[PDB]
Amino acid sequence: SSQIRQNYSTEVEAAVNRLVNLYLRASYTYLSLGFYFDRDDVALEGVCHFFRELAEEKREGAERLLKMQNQRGGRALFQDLQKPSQDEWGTTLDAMKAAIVLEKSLNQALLDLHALGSAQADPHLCDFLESHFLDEEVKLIKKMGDHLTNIQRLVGSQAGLGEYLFERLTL
Amino acid sequence: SSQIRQNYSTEVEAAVNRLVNLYLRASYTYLSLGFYFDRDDVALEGVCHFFRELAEEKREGAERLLKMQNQRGGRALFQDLQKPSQDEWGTTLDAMKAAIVLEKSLNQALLDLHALGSAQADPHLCDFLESHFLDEEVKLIKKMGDHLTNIQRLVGSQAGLGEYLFERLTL
Amino acid sequence: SSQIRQNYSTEVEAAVNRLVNLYLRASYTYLSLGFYFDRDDVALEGVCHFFRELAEEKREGAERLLKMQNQRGGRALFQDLQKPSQDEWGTTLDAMKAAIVLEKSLNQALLDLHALGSAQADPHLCDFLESHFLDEEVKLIKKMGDHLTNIQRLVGSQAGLGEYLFERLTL
Amino acid sequence: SSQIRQNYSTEVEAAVNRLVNLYLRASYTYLSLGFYFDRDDVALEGVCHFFRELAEEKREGAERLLKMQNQRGGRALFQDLQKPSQDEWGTTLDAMKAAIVLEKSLNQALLDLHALGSAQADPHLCDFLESHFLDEEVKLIKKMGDHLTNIQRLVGSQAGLGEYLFERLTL
Amino acid sequence: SSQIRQNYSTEVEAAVNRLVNLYLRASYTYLSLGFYFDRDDVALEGVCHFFRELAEEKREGAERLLKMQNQRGGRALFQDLQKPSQDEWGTTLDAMKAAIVLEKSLNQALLDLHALGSAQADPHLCDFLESHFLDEEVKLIKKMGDHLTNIQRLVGSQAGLGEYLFERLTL
Amino acid sequence: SSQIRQNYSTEVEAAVNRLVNLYLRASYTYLSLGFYFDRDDVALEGVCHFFRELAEEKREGAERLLKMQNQRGGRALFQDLQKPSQDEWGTTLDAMKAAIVLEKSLNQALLDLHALGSAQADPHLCDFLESHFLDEEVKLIKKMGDHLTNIQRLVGSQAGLGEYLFERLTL
Ligand SMILES: [Cl-]
Ligand SMILES: [Cl-]
Ligand SMILES: [Cl-]
Ligand SMILES: [Cl-]
Ligand SMILES: [Cl-]
Ligand SMILES: [Cl-]
Predict the structure, then answer these.
(1) Residue positions of B in the annotated binding site for Fe cation?
(2) N or C: which end of chain E has fewer CB within 10 A?
(3) Which residues of chain C are within 8 Å of residue A93 when distances are taken between CB atoms?
């Protein structure tokens, strides 16, 4: 039992460890998406770079949650990281749809945890999510929605052409 | 129905559009106050500049609310902008009293919307108001109260003299 | 009655206040067009930026007219600002057509006021419109006509593709 | 009754004045701890500097609370500052334990006030504590817990040696 | 009993601890005066800054006395800090009169302690007061007397006007 | 079947994907070791930093293997990442022993894969391991052996003292 722990519920502690698992899983998914778009038979470098950058952001999320865990006197506990849901990710469109689905699930986890922190009267947890995750997630989802719209407008008749142009002129 | 929208109530969406209307109305009021104090028969440049600067701040408020609207997947809807409540604004004192009344009504709108966001369990809205409006509004109201006190001390016997001196040495 | 006013007709004064209303209305229209193209389901950033920049130019127009009003000893009077004619603006093409219609109506207001100033023998008003509005308006209308032509050439068979390319390579 | 005060409960106002008293009392305690470790018969300069720096941080806390008090239109009221609980503070270990006890009581005061602000629907107070105190307090308590652990590992057989080494290589 | 203490009377040691209490009390008084003049209904920023700066100087005085205490091998002992004599400080005039009364009492404490050090044949104490307090106190009292005279000349018929002008053009 | 693949055996391809799994698992282990030594009740910052840096190096290893996979025309395939073998890592000594065990198993995987590449007559694979992994691994193992020796010499009678000193003066 901790020298520092104050106002830090076991329920929050545990949900924080699950969120770390989710973020790491997200990182892994993006590592898989990034290297799929680096395949010689896919070869969309801008799409590759976009997903690799998200791998990194999601790893950094987990790391910030682990630091906060320790700052509040909780105990990091790690679980198995499950492999991404797919081994091949189809088109840029398919991939960006899967990424928005993923982000909406991270975002709902963030909101679920905020609500718990709020029911537990844990304002530092609530602020920590407010300052470092909730707005970042909103901005990212807006950006992906923006991309989806542009990808979709570009499919038209000429899907290859549109995929090339999006990668070259937007990403 | 939106690709991005998550945890964003129609009630919040609508209140955000009304707040945009309020901020724009406030901007307009300050544009009118600014140009009244630029009249050759009023000629108080420091008072002019103070109100023009607030016109600009309130426009920027509306713009930030419109951006957030889009970031959450809501739909901006614009209404008629009603003209300022007055065509002539009297003394610096009169004007600063009207500006504090205006700001207290914007501030109560902000607090009403925070409360709604809080009842709707919308922590991103609550944080967004916290980070960009509530403290800014408090600081502005403090500053106007400070000015009012100084204007009032300067009326004394010699109202013209006091109005000149306030504009020259404070604004 | 004014210490400074000379050769400044009540007819000009009033038409100047109406032109201010028109410019502000134009600004508002462009604010609405700008945020429509920032929607996640429209997502054309170059179109957004083009219209936001015009919001700003039209606000600055009104501000210069209000300053001149005061410089000539007239009295600024503000009216209700009516909401933009549309809540959704369709394609880039639709939007640019609406913007040219708007600008042609501002331009005819400018010319109507010049003619009045000319009938009233008010050379300072005539010069002020000449120096700060008439050429600026011509240049803007030329630019919009240029854009319209390019948008139209790009519709061809492939409307999404053409809308993307115009926004990416021209705006 | 105030020209500026809005949504600022007498209950919050009073609790803010008590928190100011607590922070100042904390400052005083740290001033006493700092000068005890500057005694020629204690002579641990790094421990001295650590506590003097906290004296300063806690004074600055009180000052920020007094500023906010005025910004919200409340009235600062000062009380007697009670002397520190001890005139001599024993070992570095003893001192750091007393400092963690102190900080946990400041931290619980902060949380109590946040809860009150939350029950009173006072989001500006809640944000102000979130932005300037709650995380700072968590970080400080983590740091003191870190120090305690290191002090404790160093006692072992050789308490003087461990106290010297901690002061020389950590503080 | 001290390894370092030489020619340092218990009578001096104790009077030094009382002087520390006096200086801290003075600091507190000035902290209260500073925040009173930051009230929105008082709003005299130059008066605020003048008193806050004295809060700081008097804290630094106490700190230098505590350092010397330790340098001579005496033992710092802290007492209760009594609250300022007033919760509201009236006009700038009232406040500056109270500050001169306060400073004259600090100054008489300094002189009383010098006399004791002189009777005890403690030249280092006498020099320490000479080098760091007696002249500083004289200069401060001269400055406050200068301010009082200027405040008094400005009351005349027009007290608000004079209070504003003093704060704007002198402080 | 690949446009680029030449002299790249399915046996190598598969072993490369398993090595990626091993490196990622190693990264995870080091992430867990790093945050254990950041606990307030462990508090050895130099040990924390040493393991976090290895988390990063092992992630970069996996990333370089995934890039090479794609460069040779193989297909990255990801598996479940198993959780670290321990939730708590004991002393610095315990941790460094576990890290050397881990590295010896990575190193044997590297050598096993080199041998396979050598039996398959795949000189590019052999060179790639030579240039980017085998020497790096040797250097790291030497460094850990160096650390182990120093940790062990420092246990002596005084284990806490030795753990503190190693972290402060070596890491
Ligand atoms: Cl799975
Ligand atoms: Cl109206
Ligand atoms: Cl209308
Ligand atoms: Cl007491
Ligand atoms: Cl008292
Ligand atoms: Cl396992």
Answers:
(1) 53, 56-57, 60, 63
(2) N
(3) none
